[PDB]
Design a protein around this ligand. Structure first.
Ligand code: NA
Length: 330
């Protein structure tokens, strides 16, 4: 089997991407944030505290003939941005892009934090990291990918995120039309439950490539590229008037600037992030200070190849017995 679904930016900045997902019988379609940095499929629901719902589409398990309470199971998750959610668990049929899993754990939110409530466009998350991070207790549950894997034509999914445009998540196949050149594969450590890999280095603009190992995770659920402070300082030093602002919470730059590209290494291959991808717009409405898309990972305890980096590539998440990542230009 295979599946193919379009993923759509939630706003003009590509702050996140939503992908429609069918849950239940008859189908209830919710727009979920596919997150390769977490392992819970959770949704706004008929159980969510009413004051914490503001415009999201909810899953109502009592209207699904295939929903069953997973008795005694609870979940609770905290993300890197400080947001959180928790609740109880149903099993139900879940389809993505024509690919169906029966008996998927659908984590129904009873509580969500303010950042979820305030984002009307995201109806929940679909985690695609390793199932060892799933938060369901007392019986840990599998991700949608892990439950689909054995049925897929190939045990892979691919992320093809757009810059200010829709893109695609495919399950079970490589679309050889979706990228240029060849795919370079690189080793993954699953020890922290992430798609953790080691970049071979970087370049700023037209500058020389610096060969240096940068361990980090491929995380579709993180907007920005978070890298060591040395690397980030070297990038923003090429932008006149850029500075790190403790008041704003990262590097800012004059909105009048033209940003340089940023290149990262994948083995001997190179992925180029155009400068435009690094512009996250005014810090507040009407400001001439703009927020940067490359930020320091110092204090986060891991480097994160988020959407800024991943949307410059066609990315293969290879879930074979020994997982690997692949990157191609596109
Ligand atoms: Na922000």
């Amino acid at each position: 089997s295979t599946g193919s679904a379009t993923t759509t930016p939630i706003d003009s900045l590509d702050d996140a991407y939503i992908t429609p997902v069918q849950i239940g019988t008859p189908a209830q379609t919710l727009n979920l944030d596919f997150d390769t940095g977490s392992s819970d499929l959770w949704v706004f629901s008929s159980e969510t505290t009413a004051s914490e719902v503001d415009g999201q589409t909810i899953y109502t398990p009592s209207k699904s003939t295939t929903a069953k309470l997973l008795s005694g199971a609870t979940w609770s998750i905290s993300y890197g941005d400080g947001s959180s959610s928790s609740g109880d668990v149903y099993t139900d049929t879940v389809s993505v892009g024509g690919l169906t899993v029966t008996g998927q754990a659908v984590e129904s939110a009873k509580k969500v934090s303010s950042s979820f409530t305030e984002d009307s466009t995201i109806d929940g998350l679909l985690g695609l990291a390793f199932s060892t991070l799933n938060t369901v207790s007392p019986t840990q549950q599998k991700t949608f990918f892990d439950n689909a894997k054995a049925s897929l034509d190939s045990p892979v999914f691919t992320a093809d995120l757009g810059y200010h445009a829709p893109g695609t998540y495919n399950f079970g196949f490589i679309d050889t039309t979706a990228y240029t050149g060849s795919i370079t594969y690189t080793a993954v450590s699953t020890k922290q439950g992430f798609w953790e890999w080691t970049s071979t280095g970087y370049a700023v603009g037209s500058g020389t490539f610096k060969s240096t190992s940068i361990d980090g995770i491929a995380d579709t659920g993180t907007t920005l590229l978070y890298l060591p402070a040395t690397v980030v300082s070297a990038y923003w030093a090429q932008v006149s008037g850029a500075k790190s602002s403790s008041s704003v919470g990262g590097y800012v730059f004059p909105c009048s600037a033209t940003l340089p590209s940023f290149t990262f290494g994948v083995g001997s291959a190179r992925i180029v992030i155009p400068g435009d991808y690094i512009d996250f717009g005014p810090i507040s409405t009407g400001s001439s200070s703009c927020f940067g898309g490359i930020q320091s990972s110092a204090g986060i305890g891991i480097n994160i190849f988020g959407d800024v980096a991943l949307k410059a590539a066609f990315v293969v998440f290879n879930g074979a017995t020994t997982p690997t990542l692949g990157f191609a230009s596109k």
